[PDB]
PDB file of C-alpha atoms and ligand atoms in Angstrom:
ATOM      1  CA  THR A  22     -10.388   0.601 -11.068  1.00  0.00           C
ATOM      2  CA  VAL A  23     -11.117  -2.981 -12.610  1.00  0.00           C
ATOM      3  CA  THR A  24     -13.531  -2.796 -15.737  1.00  0.00           C
ATOM      4  CA  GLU A  25     -14.604  -7.136 -15.529  1.00  0.00           C
ATOM      5  CA  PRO A  26     -13.740  -8.658 -11.819  1.00  0.00           C
ATOM      6  CA  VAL A  27     -12.993 -12.422 -11.681  1.00  0.00           C
ATOM      7  CA  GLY A  28     -15.930 -14.314 -12.504  1.00  0.00           C
ATOM      8  CA  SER A  29     -17.177 -11.321 -15.375  1.00  0.00           C
ATOM      9  CA  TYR A  30     -13.884 -11.647 -17.817  1.00  0.00           C
ATOM     10  CA  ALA A  31     -16.533 -13.574 -20.647  1.00  0.00           C
ATOM     11  CA  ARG A  32     -17.788  -9.992 -20.136  1.00  0.00           C
ATOM     12  CA  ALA A  33     -14.225  -8.768 -21.626  1.00  0.00           C
ATOM     13  CA  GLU A  34     -14.945 -10.982 -24.957  1.00  0.00           C
ATOM     14  CA  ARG A  35     -17.388  -9.444 -27.823  1.00  0.00           C
ATOM     15  CA  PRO A  36     -20.209 -11.083 -29.193  1.00  0.00           C
ATOM     16  CA  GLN A  37     -20.478  -9.921 -32.499  1.00  0.00           C
ATOM     17  CA  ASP A  38     -17.274 -11.720 -33.116  1.00  0.00           C
ATOM     18  CA  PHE A  39     -19.383 -15.323 -32.072  1.00  0.00           C
ATOM     19  CA  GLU A  40     -23.044 -15.488 -33.882  1.00  0.00           C
ATOM     20  CA  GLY A  41     -24.684 -18.334 -34.778  1.00  0.00           C
ATOM     21  CA  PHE A  42     -24.619 -19.697 -38.024  1.00  0.00           C
ATOM     22  CA  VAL A  43     -26.231 -23.507 -37.704  1.00  0.00           C
ATOM     23  CA  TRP A  44     -28.422 -25.600 -36.295  1.00  0.00           C
ATOM     24  CA  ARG A  45     -26.179 -28.149 -34.456  1.00  0.00           C
ATOM     25  CA  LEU A  46     -27.555 -31.603 -33.713  1.00  0.00           C
ATOM     26  CA  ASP A  47     -26.836 -32.419 -30.255  1.00  0.00           C
ATOM     27  CA  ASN A  48     -27.708 -35.897 -29.802  1.00  0.00           C
ATOM     28  CA  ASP A  49     -28.076 -38.826 -31.994  1.00  0.00           C
ATOM     29  CA  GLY A  50     -30.920 -40.453 -30.622  1.00  0.00           C
ATOM     30  CA  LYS A  51     -29.320 -44.051 -30.699  1.00  0.00           C
ATOM     31  CA  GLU A  52     -28.549 -44.021 -27.016  1.00  0.00           C
ATOM     32  CA  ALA A  53     -30.825 -44.923 -24.312  1.00  0.00           C
ATOM     33  CA  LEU A  54     -30.455 -42.666 -22.405  1.00  0.00           C
ATOM     34  CA  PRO A  55     -28.397 -38.899 -22.800  1.00  0.00           C
ATOM     35  CA  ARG A  56     -24.219 -39.002 -22.193  1.00  0.00           C
ATOM     36  CA  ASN A  57     -23.362 -38.622 -18.548  1.00  0.00           C
ATOM     37  CA  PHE A  58     -26.273 -39.747 -17.085  1.00  0.00           C
ATOM     38  CA  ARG A  59     -25.122 -39.246 -13.601  1.00  0.00           C
ATOM     39  CA  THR A  60     -26.897 -38.933 -10.204  1.00  0.00           C
ATOM     40  CA  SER A  61     -26.130 -37.763  -6.189  1.00  0.00           C
ATOM     41  CA  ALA A  62     -27.580 -42.187  -5.347  1.00  0.00           C
ATOM     42  CA  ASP A  63     -23.665 -42.927  -7.443  1.00  0.00           C
ATOM     43  CA  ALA A  64     -21.394 -45.556  -6.760  1.00  0.00           C
ATOM     44  CA  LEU A  65     -18.204 -43.415  -6.014  1.00  0.00           C
ATOM     45  CA  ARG A  66     -16.043 -44.251  -8.865  1.00  0.00           C
ATOM     46  CA  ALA A  67     -11.879 -44.022  -9.794  1.00  0.00           C
ATOM     47  CA  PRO A  68     -10.885 -40.140 -10.984  1.00  0.00           C
ATOM     48  CA  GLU A  69      -9.477 -39.463 -14.567  1.00  0.00           C
ATOM     49  CA  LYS A  70      -5.823 -39.616 -15.118  1.00  0.00           C
ATOM     50  CA  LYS A  71      -6.404 -35.990 -16.305  1.00  0.00           C
ATOM     51  CA  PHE A  72      -7.151 -34.251 -13.608  1.00  0.00           C
ATOM     52  CA  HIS A  73      -4.495 -36.241 -11.464  1.00  0.00           C
ATOM     53  CA  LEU A  74      -6.432 -37.266  -8.170  1.00  0.00           C
ATOM     54  CA  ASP A  75      -5.778 -38.738  -5.033  1.00  0.00           C
ATOM     55  CA  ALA A  76      -7.170 -42.575  -6.347  1.00  0.00           C
ATOM     56  CA  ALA A  77      -6.312 -43.187  -2.219  1.00  0.00           C
ATOM     57  CA  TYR A  78      -8.395 -40.852  -1.419  1.00  0.00           C
ATOM     58  CA  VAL A  79     -12.068 -41.609   0.041  1.00  0.00           C
ATOM     59  CA  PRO A  80     -14.192 -38.923  -0.070  1.00  0.00           C
ATOM     60  CA  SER A  81     -17.245 -38.546   2.692  1.00  0.00           C
ATOM     61  CA  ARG A  82     -21.133 -39.712   1.565  1.00  0.00           C
ATOM     62  CA  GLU A  83     -22.270 -37.393   4.105  1.00  0.00           C
ATOM     63  CA  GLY A  84     -25.680 -35.846   2.909  1.00  0.00           C
ATOM     64  CA  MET A  85     -25.035 -37.255  -0.597  1.00  0.00           C
ATOM     65  CA  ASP A  86     -29.151 -40.157   0.219  1.00  0.00           C
ATOM     66  CA  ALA A  87     -31.062 -36.970   0.917  1.00  0.00           C
ATOM     67  CA  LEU A  88     -28.851 -34.121  -2.236  1.00  0.00           C
ATOM     68  CA  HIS A  89     -31.375 -35.849  -4.756  1.00  0.00           C
ATOM     69  CA  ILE A  90     -29.698 -34.370  -7.505  1.00  0.00           C
ATOM     70  CA  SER A  91     -28.079 -35.595 -11.472  1.00  0.00           C
ATOM     71  CA  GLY A  92     -26.607 -34.582 -15.093  1.00  0.00           C
ATOM     72  CA  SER A  93     -26.492 -35.005 -18.091  1.00  0.00           C
ATOM     73  CA  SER A  94     -26.284 -33.619 -21.645  1.00  0.00           C
ATOM     74  CA  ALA A  95     -28.610 -32.907 -24.421  1.00  0.00           C
ATOM     75  CA  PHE A  96     -31.464 -35.177 -25.240  1.00  0.00           C
ATOM     76  CA  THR A  97     -33.430 -36.356 -27.663  1.00  0.00           C
ATOM     77  CA  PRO A  98     -37.692 -36.226 -26.174  1.00  0.00           C
ATOM     78  CA  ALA A  99     -37.629 -40.737 -26.868  1.00  0.00           C
ATOM     79  CA  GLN A 100     -34.388 -39.392 -24.421  1.00  0.00           C
ATOM     80  CA  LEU A 101     -35.896 -37.377 -21.750  1.00  0.00           C
ATOM     81  CA  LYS A 102     -38.345 -39.827 -20.884  1.00  0.00           C
ATOM     82  CA  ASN A 103     -35.954 -42.908 -20.107  1.00  0.00           C
ATOM     83  CA  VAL A 104     -34.194 -40.352 -16.954  1.00  0.00           C
ATOM     84  CA  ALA A 105     -37.387 -39.927 -16.095  1.00  0.00           C
ATOM     85  CA  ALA A 106     -38.916 -42.614 -15.386  1.00  0.00           C
ATOM     86  CA  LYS A 107     -35.557 -43.882 -13.945  1.00  0.00           C
ATOM     87  CA  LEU A 108     -35.533 -41.226 -11.442  1.00  0.00           C
ATOM     88  CA  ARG A 109     -39.373 -41.568 -10.694  1.00  0.00           C
ATOM     89  CA  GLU A 110     -37.713 -44.672  -8.456  1.00  0.00           C
ATOM     90  CA  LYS A 111     -35.998 -42.580  -7.145  1.00  0.00           C
ATOM     91  CA  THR A 112     -38.592 -39.798  -6.235  1.00  0.00           C
ATOM     92  CA  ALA A 113     -41.958 -39.406  -5.878  1.00  0.00           C
ATOM     93  CA  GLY A 114     -41.304 -35.665  -5.028  1.00  0.00           C
ATOM     94  CA  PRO A 115     -40.330 -32.954  -8.319  1.00  0.00           C
ATOM     95  CA  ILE A 116     -38.599 -33.653 -10.922  1.00  0.00           C
ATOM     96  CA  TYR A 117     -36.452 -30.865 -12.656  1.00  0.00           C
ATOM     97  CA  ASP A 118     -34.891 -30.167 -15.905  1.00  0.00           C
ATOM     98  CA  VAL A 119     -32.742 -27.164 -15.952  1.00  0.00           C
ATOM     99  CA  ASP A 120     -31.817 -25.699 -18.778  1.00  0.00           C
ATOM    100  CA  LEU A 121     -28.191 -24.154 -18.154  1.00  0.00           C
ATOM    101  CA  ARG A 122     -28.120 -23.133 -21.665  1.00  0.00           C
ATOM    102  CA  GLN A 123     -27.930 -20.142 -22.982  1.00  0.00           C
ATOM    103  CA  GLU A 124     -28.083 -21.010 -26.549  1.00  0.00           C
ATOM    104  CA  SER A 125     -30.725 -21.165 -28.121  1.00  0.00           C
ATOM    105  CA  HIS A 126     -32.020 -24.375 -28.584  1.00  0.00           C
ATOM    106  CA  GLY A 127     -34.963 -26.735 -29.126  1.00  0.00           C
ATOM    107  CA  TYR A 128     -36.992 -29.036 -30.711  1.00  0.00           C
ATOM    108  CA  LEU A 129     -37.025 -29.206 -35.231  1.00  0.00           C
ATOM    109  CA  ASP A 130     -39.039 -32.731 -35.867  1.00  0.00           C
ATOM    110  CA  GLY A 131     -38.558 -34.040 -32.494  1.00  0.00           C
ATOM    111  CA  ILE A 132     -34.858 -33.333 -33.471  1.00  0.00           C
ATOM    112  CA  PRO A 133     -32.177 -31.852 -30.464  1.00  0.00           C
ATOM    113  CA  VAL A 134     -30.617 -29.542 -32.207  1.00  0.00           C
ATOM    114  CA  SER A 135     -29.331 -25.691 -31.272  1.00  0.00           C
ATOM    115  CA  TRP A 136     -28.285 -22.635 -32.785  1.00  0.00           C
ATOM    116  CA  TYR A 137     -24.599 -22.315 -32.556  1.00  0.00           C
ATOM    117  CA  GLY A 138     -22.388 -19.823 -33.884  1.00  0.00           C
ATOM    118  CA  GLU A 139     -17.930 -19.548 -32.762  1.00  0.00           C
ATOM    119  CA  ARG A 140     -17.609 -21.172 -29.190  1.00  0.00           C
ATOM    120  CA  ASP A 141     -21.088 -22.140 -28.942  1.00  0.00           C
ATOM    121  CA  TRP A 142     -20.990 -18.160 -28.474  1.00  0.00           C
ATOM    122  CA  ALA A 143     -24.235 -17.209 -30.137  1.00  0.00           C
ATOM    123  CA  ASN A 144     -26.502 -15.355 -26.999  1.00  0.00           C
ATOM    124  CA  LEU A 145     -22.775 -14.644 -25.611  1.00  0.00           C
ATOM    125  CA  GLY A 146     -23.099 -10.682 -23.557  1.00  0.00           C
ATOM    126  CA  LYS A 147     -27.730 -10.856 -23.792  1.00  0.00           C
ATOM    127  CA  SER A 148     -29.701 -11.095 -20.817  1.00  0.00           C
ATOM    128  CA  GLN A 149     -32.094 -13.831 -19.960  1.00  0.00           C
ATOM    129  CA  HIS A 150     -35.082 -12.195 -21.789  1.00  0.00           C
ATOM    130  CA  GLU A 151     -33.201 -11.393 -24.508  1.00  0.00           C
ATOM    131  CA  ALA A 152     -31.447 -15.290 -24.897  1.00  0.00           C
ATOM    132  CA  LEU A 153     -34.817 -16.396 -24.813  1.00  0.00           C
ATOM    133  CA  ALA A 154     -36.732 -14.274 -26.891  1.00  0.00           C
ATOM    134  CA  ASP A 155     -33.821 -14.914 -30.343  1.00  0.00           C
ATOM    135  CA  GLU A 156     -34.275 -19.025 -28.353  1.00  0.00           C
ATOM    136  CA  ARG A 157     -38.216 -18.381 -29.218  1.00  0.00           C
ATOM    137  CA  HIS A 158     -38.108 -16.325 -32.517  1.00  0.00           C
ATOM    138  CA  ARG A 159     -35.809 -18.685 -34.256  1.00  0.00           C
ATOM    139  CA  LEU A 160     -38.175 -21.721 -33.166  1.00  0.00           C
ATOM    140  CA  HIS A 161     -41.551 -20.210 -34.812  1.00  0.00           C
ATOM    141  CA  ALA A 162     -39.336 -19.175 -38.148  1.00  0.00           C
ATOM    142  CA  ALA A 163     -37.937 -23.046 -38.840  1.00  0.00           C
ATOM    143  CA  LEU A 164     -41.714 -23.910 -39.185  1.00  0.00           C
ATOM    144  CA  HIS A 165     -41.800 -25.427 -42.370  1.00  0.00           C
ATOM    145  CA  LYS A 166     -38.805 -24.234 -43.293  1.00  0.00           C
ATOM    146  CA  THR A 167     -35.674 -25.313 -45.045  1.00  0.00           C
ATOM    147  CA  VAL A 168     -33.251 -26.023 -42.466  1.00  0.00           C
ATOM    148  CA  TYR A 169     -29.814 -27.772 -42.068  1.00  0.00           C
ATOM    149  CA  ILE A 170     -29.183 -29.390 -39.886  1.00  0.00           C
ATOM    150  CA  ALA A 171     -25.821 -30.846 -38.895  1.00  0.00           C
ATOM    151  CA  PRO A 172     -22.613 -32.374 -35.699  1.00  0.00           C
ATOM    152  CA  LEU A 173     -19.376 -31.020 -35.376  1.00  0.00           C
ATOM    153  CA  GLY A 174     -16.008 -32.104 -36.802  1.00  0.00           C
ATOM    154  CA  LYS A 175     -12.668 -31.974 -34.703  1.00  0.00           C
ATOM    155  CA  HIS A 176     -12.628 -27.787 -35.832  1.00  0.00           C
ATOM    156  CA  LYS A 177     -16.109 -27.873 -34.857  1.00  0.00           C
ATOM    157  CA  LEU A 178     -17.694 -27.046 -38.089  1.00  0.00           C
ATOM    158  CA  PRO A 179     -20.648 -28.698 -39.796  1.00  0.00           C
ATOM    159  CA  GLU A 180     -19.749 -32.081 -41.225  1.00  0.00           C
ATOM    160  CA  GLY A 181     -22.398 -34.043 -43.398  1.00  0.00           C
ATOM    161  CA  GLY A 182     -26.276 -33.892 -41.580  1.00  0.00           C
ATOM    162  CA  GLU A 183     -29.515 -33.255 -42.958  1.00  0.00           C
ATOM    163  CA  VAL A 184     -31.435 -31.319 -44.993  1.00  0.00           C
ATOM    164  CA  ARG A 185     -35.400 -30.999 -44.484  1.00  0.00           C
ATOM    165  CA  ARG A 186     -38.746 -28.726 -44.509  1.00  0.00           C
ATOM    166  CA  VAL A 187     -39.269 -28.834 -40.370  1.00  0.00           C
ATOM    167  CA  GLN A 188     -43.384 -29.648 -39.873  1.00  0.00           C
ATOM    168  CA  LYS A 189     -43.332 -29.745 -35.669  1.00  0.00           C
ATOM    169  CA  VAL A 190     -40.857 -27.202 -33.613  1.00  0.00           C
ATOM    170  CA  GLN A 191     -40.889 -27.738 -29.936  1.00  0.00           C
ATOM    171  CA  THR A 192     -39.515 -25.634 -27.101  1.00  0.00           C
ATOM    172  CA  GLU A 193     -37.280 -27.779 -24.245  1.00  0.00           C
ATOM    173  CA  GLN A 194     -40.383 -26.479 -22.137  1.00  0.00           C
ATOM    174  CA  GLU A 195     -43.022 -28.152 -23.615  1.00  0.00           C
ATOM    175  CA  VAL A 196     -40.421 -31.851 -23.879  1.00  0.00           C
ATOM    176  CA  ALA A 197     -40.273 -31.339 -20.377  1.00  0.00           C
ATOM    177  CA  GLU A 198     -43.402 -31.457 -19.372  1.00  0.00           C
ATOM    178  CA  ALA A 199     -44.671 -34.123 -21.646  1.00  0.00           C
ATOM    179  CA  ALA A 200     -41.849 -36.093 -20.089  1.00  0.00           C
ATOM    180  CA  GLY A 201     -44.253 -34.913 -17.149  1.00  0.00           C
ATOM    181  CA  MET A 202     -40.899 -32.731 -15.125  1.00  0.00           C
ATOM    182  CA  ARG A 203     -41.190 -29.262 -14.482  1.00  0.00           C
ATOM    183  CA  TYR A 204     -39.592 -26.704 -15.804  1.00  0.00           C
ATOM    184  CA  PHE A 205     -36.333 -24.334 -15.344  1.00  0.00           C
ATOM    185  CA  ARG A 206     -33.805 -22.673 -17.183  1.00  0.00           C
ATOM    186  CA  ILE A 207     -30.809 -21.153 -16.708  1.00  0.00           C
ATOM    187  CA  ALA A 208     -29.152 -19.372 -19.323  1.00  0.00           C
ATOM    188  CA  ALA A 209     -25.360 -19.475 -18.956  1.00  0.00           C
ATOM    189  CA  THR A 210     -23.229 -19.446 -21.115  1.00  0.00           C
ATOM    190  CA  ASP A 211     -20.512 -22.339 -22.471  1.00  0.00           C
ATOM    191  CA  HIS A 212     -17.377 -22.541 -21.377  1.00  0.00           C
ATOM    192  CA  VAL A 213     -17.009 -19.786 -18.453  1.00  0.00           C
ATOM    193  CA  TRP A 214     -18.304 -19.685 -14.968  1.00  0.00           C
ATOM    194  CA  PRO A 215     -21.904 -18.434 -14.523  1.00  0.00           C
ATOM    195  CA  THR A 216     -22.710 -14.796 -13.949  1.00  0.00           C
ATOM    196  CA  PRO A 217     -24.180 -13.860 -10.685  1.00  0.00           C
ATOM    197  CA  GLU A 218     -27.327 -12.999 -12.938  1.00  0.00           C
ATOM    198  CA  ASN A 219     -26.723 -17.243 -13.287  1.00  0.00           C
ATOM    199  CA  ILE A 220     -26.372 -17.589 -10.033  1.00  0.00           C
ATOM    200  CA  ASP A 221     -28.465 -15.186  -8.167  1.00  0.00           C
ATOM    201  CA  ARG A 222     -31.765 -16.879  -9.447  1.00  0.00           C
ATOM    202  CA  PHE A 223     -30.842 -19.983  -9.496  1.00  0.00           C
ATOM    203  CA  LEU A 224     -30.092 -19.508  -5.686  1.00  0.00           C
ATOM    204  CA  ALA A 225     -33.356 -17.830  -5.842  1.00  0.00           C
ATOM    205  CA  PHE A 226     -34.572 -20.946  -6.757  1.00  0.00           C
ATOM    206  CA  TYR A 227     -32.898 -23.356  -5.189  1.00  0.00           C
ATOM    207  CA  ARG A 228     -34.608 -21.847  -1.874  1.00  0.00           C
ATOM    208  CA  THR A 229     -38.412 -22.492  -2.944  1.00  0.00           C
ATOM    209  CA  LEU A 230     -38.259 -26.113  -3.720  1.00  0.00           C
ATOM    210  CA  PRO A 231     -40.011 -28.413  -1.834  1.00  0.00           C
ATOM    211  CA  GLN A 232     -37.869 -30.742  -0.106  1.00  0.00           C
ATOM    212  CA  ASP A 233     -38.330 -33.493  -2.038  1.00  0.00           C
ATOM    213  CA  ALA A 234     -37.222 -31.738  -5.201  1.00  0.00           C
ATOM    214  CA  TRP A 235     -35.084 -34.313  -7.833  1.00  0.00           C
ATOM    215  CA  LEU A 236     -32.961 -31.080  -9.844  1.00  0.00           C
ATOM    216  CA  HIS A 237     -32.003 -32.422 -12.966  1.00  0.00           C
ATOM    217  CA  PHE A 238     -29.052 -30.768 -14.406  1.00  0.00           C
ATOM    218  CA  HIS A 239     -28.711 -30.049 -17.823  1.00  0.00           C
ATOM    219  CA  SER A 240     -26.330 -28.017 -20.964  1.00  0.00           C
ATOM    220  CA  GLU A 241     -24.851 -29.538 -24.083  1.00  0.00           C
ATOM    221  CA  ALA A 242     -21.721 -32.363 -23.415  1.00  0.00           C
ATOM    222  CA  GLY A 243     -23.567 -32.117 -19.257  1.00  0.00           C
ATOM    223  CA  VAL A 244     -19.959 -31.570 -18.682  1.00  0.00           C
ATOM    224  CA  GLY A 245     -18.899 -27.577 -17.666  1.00  0.00           C
ATOM    225  CA  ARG A 246     -22.124 -26.030 -16.938  1.00  0.00           C
ATOM    226  CA  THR A 247     -23.559 -29.489 -15.412  1.00  0.00           C
ATOM    227  CA  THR A 248     -20.946 -29.747 -13.433  1.00  0.00           C
ATOM    228  CA  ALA A 249     -20.533 -26.286 -11.830  1.00  0.00           C
ATOM    229  CA  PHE A 250     -24.670 -26.434 -10.294  1.00  0.00           C
ATOM    230  CA  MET A 251     -24.950 -30.090  -9.093  1.00  0.00           C
ATOM    231  CA  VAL A 252     -20.860 -28.726  -7.361  1.00  0.00           C
ATOM    232  CA  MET A 253     -22.965 -25.549  -5.745  1.00  0.00           C
ATOM    233  CA  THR A 254     -26.100 -27.410  -4.815  1.00  0.00           C
ATOM    234  CA  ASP A 255     -24.221 -30.245  -3.251  1.00  0.00           C
ATOM    235  CA  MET A 256     -22.645 -26.675  -0.979  1.00  0.00           C
ATOM    236  CA  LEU A 257     -25.562 -25.550  -0.394  1.00  0.00           C
ATOM    237  CA  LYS A 258     -27.175 -28.358   1.376  1.00  0.00           C
ATOM    238  CA  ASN A 259     -24.441 -30.367   2.981  1.00  0.00           C
ATOM    239  CA  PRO A 260     -22.201 -27.229   3.667  1.00  0.00           C
ATOM    240  CA  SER A 261     -20.812 -29.252   6.281  1.00  0.00           C
ATOM    241  CA  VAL A 262     -19.114 -30.991   3.493  1.00  0.00           C
ATOM    242  CA  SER A 263     -15.825 -29.937   2.733  1.00  0.00           C
ATOM    243  CA  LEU A 264     -14.284 -28.503  -0.042  1.00  0.00           C
ATOM    244  CA  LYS A 265     -12.177 -31.656  -0.862  1.00  0.00           C
ATOM    245  CA  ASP A 266     -15.225 -33.485  -0.365  1.00  0.00           C
ATOM    246  CA  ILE A 267     -17.622 -32.005  -2.945  1.00  0.00           C
ATOM    247  CA  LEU A 268     -15.678 -31.857  -5.690  1.00  0.00           C
ATOM    248  CA  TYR A 269     -13.994 -35.301  -5.101  1.00  0.00           C
ATOM    249  CA  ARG A 270     -17.148 -36.743  -4.982  1.00  0.00           C
ATOM    250  CA  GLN A 271     -19.352 -34.360  -7.514  1.00  0.00           C
ATOM    251  CA  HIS A 272     -16.729 -35.590 -10.129  1.00  0.00           C
ATOM    252  CA  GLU A 273     -15.812 -39.255  -9.105  1.00  0.00           C
ATOM    253  CA  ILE A 274     -20.140 -40.075  -9.434  1.00  0.00           C
ATOM    254  CA  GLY A 275     -19.214 -38.653 -13.523  1.00  0.00           C
ATOM    255  CA  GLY A 276     -18.947 -35.394 -12.973  1.00  0.00           C
ATOM    256  CA  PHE A 277     -16.430 -32.600 -13.995  1.00  0.00           C
ATOM    257  CA  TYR A 278     -13.177 -31.851 -11.139  1.00  0.00           C
ATOM    258  CA  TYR A 279     -13.940 -28.327 -10.264  1.00  0.00           C
ATOM    259  CA  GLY A 280     -10.602 -28.105  -8.192  1.00  0.00           C
ATOM    260  CA  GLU A 281      -7.278 -27.005  -9.341  1.00  0.00           C
ATOM    261  CA  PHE A 282      -4.868 -29.699 -11.708  1.00  0.00           C
ATOM    262  CA  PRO A 283      -3.007 -29.482 -14.730  1.00  0.00           C
ATOM    263  CA  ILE A 284      -4.318 -27.814 -17.079  1.00  0.00           C
ATOM    264  CA  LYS A 285      -3.888 -29.067 -20.784  1.00  0.00           C
ATOM    265  CA  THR A 286      -5.315 -27.695 -23.624  1.00  0.00           C
ATOM    266  CA  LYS A 287      -4.928 -27.989 -27.822  1.00  0.00           C
ATOM    267  CA  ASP A 288      -3.502 -25.040 -28.941  1.00  0.00           C
ATOM    268  CA  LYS A 289      -7.207 -24.412 -31.311  1.00  0.00           C
ATOM    269  CA  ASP A 290      -8.427 -24.477 -27.650  1.00  0.00           C
ATOM    270  CA  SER A 291      -5.986 -22.210 -25.814  1.00  0.00           C
ATOM    271  CA  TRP A 292      -9.141 -20.053 -25.346  1.00  0.00           C
ATOM    272  CA  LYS A 293     -10.785 -22.202 -23.413  1.00  0.00           C
ATOM    273  CA  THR A 294      -7.104 -22.364 -20.583  1.00  0.00           C
ATOM    274  CA  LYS A 295      -8.454 -18.443 -18.452  1.00  0.00           C
ATOM    275  CA  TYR A 296     -11.461 -19.641 -18.591  1.00  0.00           C
ATOM    276  CA  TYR A 297     -10.766 -22.570 -16.476  1.00  0.00           C
ATOM    277  CA  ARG A 298      -9.051 -20.947 -13.451  1.00  0.00           C
ATOM    278  CA  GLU A 299     -11.170 -18.576 -13.591  1.00  0.00           C
ATOM    279  CA  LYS A 300     -13.931 -21.133 -13.070  1.00  0.00           C
ATOM    280  CA  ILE A 301     -11.116 -22.380 -10.773  1.00  0.00           C
ATOM    281  CA  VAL A 302     -11.574 -19.115  -8.748  1.00  0.00           C
ATOM    282  CA  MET A 303     -15.476 -18.639  -8.509  1.00  0.00           C
ATOM    283  CA  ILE A 304     -15.562 -22.346  -7.160  1.00  0.00           C
ATOM    284  CA  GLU A 305     -13.581 -21.209  -3.936  1.00  0.00           C
ATOM    285  CA  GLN A 306     -15.548 -17.264  -3.516  1.00  0.00           C
ATOM    286  CA  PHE A 307     -18.848 -19.813  -3.128  1.00  0.00           C
ATOM    287  CA  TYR A 308     -17.717 -22.420  -0.414  1.00  0.00           C
ATOM    288  CA  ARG A 309     -17.231 -19.287   0.841  1.00  0.00           C
ATOM    289  CA  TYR A 310     -20.302 -17.311  -0.099  1.00  0.00           C
ATOM    290  CA  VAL A 311     -22.202 -21.006   1.377  1.00  0.00           C
ATOM    291  CA  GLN A 312     -20.146 -21.324   4.659  1.00  0.00           C
ATOM    292  CA  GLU A 313     -20.374 -17.050   5.855  1.00  0.00           C
ATOM    293  CA  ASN A 314     -23.936 -16.607   4.609  1.00  0.00           C
ATOM    294  CA  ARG A 315     -25.886 -19.670   5.551  1.00  0.00           C
ATOM    295  CA  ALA A 316     -25.991 -19.354   9.041  1.00  0.00           C
ATOM    296  CA  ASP A 317     -28.754 -16.405   8.349  1.00  0.00           C
ATOM    297  CA  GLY A 318     -31.142 -17.639   5.787  1.00  0.00           C
ATOM    298  CA  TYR A 319     -29.223 -16.418   3.097  1.00  0.00           C
ATOM    299  CA  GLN A 320     -30.343 -12.645   3.185  1.00  0.00           C
ATOM    300  CA  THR A 321     -27.282 -11.015   1.143  1.00  0.00           C
ATOM    301  CA  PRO A 322     -27.566 -12.028  -2.682  1.00  0.00           C
ATOM    302  CA  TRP A 323     -25.107 -14.140  -4.158  1.00  0.00           C
ATOM    303  CA  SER A 324     -23.729 -10.643  -6.801  1.00  0.00           C
ATOM    304  CA  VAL A 325     -24.271  -8.012  -3.865  1.00  0.00           C
ATOM    305  CA  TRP A 326     -21.800  -9.998  -1.861  1.00  0.00           C
ATOM    306  CA  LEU A 327     -19.503 -11.196  -4.647  1.00  0.00           C
ATOM    307  CA  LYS A 328     -19.215  -7.082  -5.709  1.00  0.00           C
ATOM    308  CA  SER A 329     -18.735  -6.902  -1.450  1.00  0.00           C
ATOM    309  CA  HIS A 330     -15.982  -9.652  -0.912  1.00  0.00           C
ATOM    310  CA  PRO A 331     -14.746  -9.827  -5.335  1.00  0.00           C
ATOM    311  CA  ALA A 332     -12.691 -13.707  -5.864  1.00  0.00           C
ATOM    312  CA  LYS A 333      -8.446 -12.954  -6.401  1.00  0.00           C
ATOM    313  CA  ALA A 334      -7.255 -13.774 -10.333  1.00  0.00           C
ATOM    314  CA  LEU A 335      -5.545 -16.823 -10.939  1.00  0.00           C
TER     315      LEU A 335
HETATM  316 CL1   CL B   1     -30.326 -11.350 -16.979  1.00  0.00          CL
END
């Protein structure tokens, strides 16, 4: 009897130990665009040394022109508008803001903030219903109230920032719509592989999208969670493309590399190590799901299939 199967390790952590304690500044708004902005129309560039990949390797671009996806970090409303404008030049289809953040976040006086708990796990273990409920309550509770908004220091603790009496509160959905983008939330926990719940939701959503739909994925940094879903979308829309080509091309356009590599972390970040290994295994497990379920149109949901074909630990 296994308590937590591969892909659900995070379920063993205690939520009560990472509760939110401060409104974190998600972006200073000094740049015109969010950080790590990238699209599937972008040219591939040299891989990052840390991933020890083959720089001479030329990944196939098959299906990238019609992939129509992009990724980025969190953003201010103005930055989102700039993103929408840039994407509108590439498509005449609906542009979706796919919010992959489980952590409660929103905008106070137009400032992008999030209720930060240690490890960014303020909503760990909560269902999407509970997470959004927490988010809605906190945002509203901030109106006409004094709050402290601050960026984090090297040890993930408040550093400087500012104090203000909020006069306007907005959800990301509001910001997205005001930017001319449709909105879709997937409460994925930061630093770990998306839950079976997260993926089932995405998969159902993905199946009903128009042919010309453009997906702009984003999380906090625009790296871990953002790349995982960009990778999954790439595999789903281009099942004939090898796992290697998918992983390489998603990384070389500016994303994270989800294949094996010499994982290295500072002592204070040693806790992230097993979660990185788990994601590597689950990336391969999803690829297997796509290859073995595409033929019948994915009649079997990911969560169901996963239980029938559990991934092997690392
Ligand atoms: Cl849920």
